Design an enzyme around this catalytic site. Structure first.
Site, mmCIF file in Angstrom:
data_model
loop_
_atom_site.group_PDB
_atom_site.id
_atom_site.type_symbol
_atom_site.label_atom_id
_atom_site.label_comp_id
_atom_site.label_asym_id
_atom_site.label_seq_id
_atom_site.Cartn_x
_atom_site.Cartn_y
_atom_site.Cartn_z
ATOM 1 N N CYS A 1 0.864 -1.206 0.000
ATOM 2 C CA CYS A 1 0.000 0.000 0.000
ATOM 3 C C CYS A 1 0.892 1.244 0.000
ATOM 4 O O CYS A 1 0.775 2.073 -0.932
ATOM 5 C CB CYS A 1 -0.958 0.002 1.184
ATOM 6 S SG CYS A 1 -2.455 -0.970 0.878
ATOM 7 N N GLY A 2 1.760 1.361 1.005
ATOM 8 C CA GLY A 2 2.602 2.554 1.205
ATOM 9 C C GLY A 2 1.741 3.768 1.483
ATOM 10 O O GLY A 2 0.693 3.581 2.127
ATOM 11 N N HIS A 3 2.126 4.935 0.954
ATOM 12 C CA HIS A 3 1.558 6.259 1.325
ATOM 13 C C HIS A 3 0.099 6.393 0.848
ATOM 14 O O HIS A 3 -0.599 7.268 1.385
ATOM 15 C CB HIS A 3 2.479 7.388 0.840
ATOM 16 C CG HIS A 3 2.934 7.248 -0.573
ATOM 17 N ND1 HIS A 3 4.184 6.765 -0.898
ATOM 18 C CD2 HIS A 3 2.303 7.508 -1.741
ATOM 19 C CE1 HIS A 3 4.302 6.724 -2.209
ATOM 20 N NE2 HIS A 3 3.167 7.196 -2.753
ATOM 21 N N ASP B 1 9.404 9.065 -8.086
ATOM 22 C CA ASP B 1 8.306 9.226 -7.114
ATOM 23 C C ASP B 1 8.174 10.715 -6.834
ATOM 24 O O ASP B 1 9.203 11.364 -6.545
ATOM 25 C CB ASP B 1 8.580 8.470 -5.822
ATOM 26 C CG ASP B 1 7.359 8.307 -4.931
ATOM 27 O OD1 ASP B 1 6.421 9.133 -5.033
ATOM 28 O OD2 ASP B 1 7.358 7.355 -4.129
ATOM 29 N N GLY C 1 6.984 6.764 1.238
ATOM 30 C CA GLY C 1 6.642 6.220 2.572
ATOM 31 C C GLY C 1 7.555 5.076 2.988
ATOM 32 O O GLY C 1 8.041 5.098 4.113
ATOM 33 N N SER C 2 7.767 4.111 2.095
ATOM 34 C CA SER C 2 8.819 3.059 2.171
ATOM 35 C C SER C 2 10.192 3.691 2.396
ATOM 36 O O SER C 2 10.890 3.262 3.308
ATOM 37 C CB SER C 2 8.838 2.219 0.920
ATOM 38 O OG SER C 2 7.520 1.911 0.496
#
Lengths: 337, 329
Positions: A101-103, A252, A257-258
């Site tokens: 999912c991340g951000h 990006d 987020g990762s």
């Protein structure tokens, strides 16, 4: 004299795909509200398989051109098997069906609250708990609100450092020292200056070519991609600027987020940062800022890991109704060779 | 709708595409574009409402290859509508293949009264910054659109050029509403049918910079300029290394001029042009000879299909740092 909202000429019998367009620090997210056929599956995993193998034309329509683009991302909301979950998410991208999912949790969290998948908290409390079922698993997002708008925060998976001060011969530059960490994905970390680029001024194409070279080098001599940094890993109130180049030379638009997660793990490991100490990460692309905070130590096999609190803002950008004409050769979209 | 800032009106669009290149037609939420003339109105937009352009065309709600249209009244009594074009580099003048979409739009949305039941094509008069272009739109309201080019001619043929990358190659420069260098893909050591877009772009860019040393951009060709029923594949790389999703309307025009000049094509002979990028097809046809100073020009009938893709409402959050959009550069 076009007072009455009307659709344009379309093929009736292919329903209208309706989206809410959001963005998290410049990365877009199309959340599908309506017009996706039933995604049949006893589980989220089953549902991901069914979409990839039966309804992929829907993904291609929303994410590919002419209705999307190279760096568009998507989400189809589905029931979860877990009774804990407020919602299940199937992620869409231009390369296939993602797990991390991340951000996008930041947007989906905000969405779930604003669209009533989650009842509003008591007027006294301001942060609401949204349980999102990713293919990843159940992620809890905490959304600040009034009685709404504000930052969202979530807790990372176990994040650790795989290797530090690893020397590699990157084509185009000399032997270079990289750190490889896991923040939900494996990223090589290099200073932009160490590849002979100023992160603040250099053209995106230059930073991409450099970062790609490192990623290819590490692939053979040892990985989702490479993050170039301003080299401010030393603790400060000043934000640290990073650029993430992953997959096929894809930049990006957000502080990944990762990436935030893996950099906090790296900062923790080098003794530059303590638990509940919070840094700010700035995107070189867009200028948007996510904050990281190591909250507790943990383990990942033999590896000493950390748990990271990533927080940031998602914003609404608008709403679209996608239609297809029976005639259109590019009904189901296209991507450049 | 999602939670938005009331007091910034909702921008409403109809998304179309002509052969893969997109066009956002703005239906509502654009401030009054004040101006006695279309020219005045284009100036006013560029100098006062550019935030609207940046919103609709920039990365959050658009992308590097997005194009836009704001419809305005025309000073010309002939005109059904006036068009202000928007792009990621500024405010275009070239009417372009956007007439294909705008023609179809004007008919389907009633800017043009419904055609006589007997006649199967309608006349849409579009006032572009360039001037008044007439689009002929097939109806019974769906179907292909056709328009007539400006005077299109050849500026230079078989010109050997100083290319930093390949040494020396022969290029043709023609005008189809813009100046394009034409070279064969094979002549740069690329197979147009297989090669990665990045390869074709850097090659074509090199030619464009080289020709400046001796121009809107460069078109790489199939080399099949010889008349046949088989379509000819081209790839257009213009401005800052930005690829065209369609067989460029201008590009079709210029190569028809080039094919006419080399005696490979006669008046009312029709070729088909295929996009390397998407596979979409425009038809070119030289209809009559003409003149451009001492230069022998030709008039070209460009025809293609425009398709609806959907509809959006764009909103602003007063909080959003990227309210007005952003570009990577």
């Amino acid at each position: 004299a076009l007072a009455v909202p009307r659709l344009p000429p379309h093929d009736p019998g292919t329903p209208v795909l309706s989206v809410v367009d959001m963005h998290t620090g410049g990365e877009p997210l199309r959340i599908v509200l309506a017009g996706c056929p039933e995604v049949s599956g006893p589980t989220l995993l089953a549902k991901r398989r069914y979409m990839r193998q039966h309804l992929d034309h829907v993904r291609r329509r929303l994410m590919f051109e002419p209705r999307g683009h190279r760096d568009m991302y998507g989400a189809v909301l589905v029931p979860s098997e877990l009774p804990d979950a407020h919602l299940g998410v199937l992620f869409l991208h231009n390369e296939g069906y993602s797990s991390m999912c991340g951000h996008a949790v930041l947007a989906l969290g905000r969405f779930a609250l604003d669209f009533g998948l989650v009842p509003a908290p008591p007027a006294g409390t301001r942060e609401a708990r949204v349980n999102i079922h990713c293919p990843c698993g159940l992620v809890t997002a905490f959304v600040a609100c009034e009685d709404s708008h504000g930052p969202v925060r979530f807790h990372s998976v176990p994040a650790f450092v795989l290797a530090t001060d690893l020397m590699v011969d990157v084509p185009g530059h000399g032997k270079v020292m990289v750190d490889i960490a896991y923040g939900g994905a494996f990223y090589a970390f290099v200073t932009a200056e160490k590849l002979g680029l100023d992160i603040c001024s250099a053209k995106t194409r230059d930073l991409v070519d450099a970062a790609s070279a490192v990623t290819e080098a590490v692939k053979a001599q040892f990985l989702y991609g490479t993050i170039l940094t301003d080299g401010k890993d030393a603790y400060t109130k000043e934000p640290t600027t990073n650029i993430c180049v992953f997959a096929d030379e894809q930049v990006d638009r957000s502080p990944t987020g990762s990436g935030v997660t893996a950099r906090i793990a790296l900062q923790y490991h080098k003794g530059l940062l303590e638990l509940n100490q919070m840094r700010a990460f700035k995107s070189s692309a867009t200028g948007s800022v996510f904050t990281g905070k190591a909250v507790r130590e943990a383990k990942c096999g033999d590896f000493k890991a950390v748990i990271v609190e990533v927080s940031g803002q998602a914003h609404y950008t608008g709403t679209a109704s996608f239609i297809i004409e029976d005639d259109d050769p590019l009904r189901d979209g296209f991507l450049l060779k």
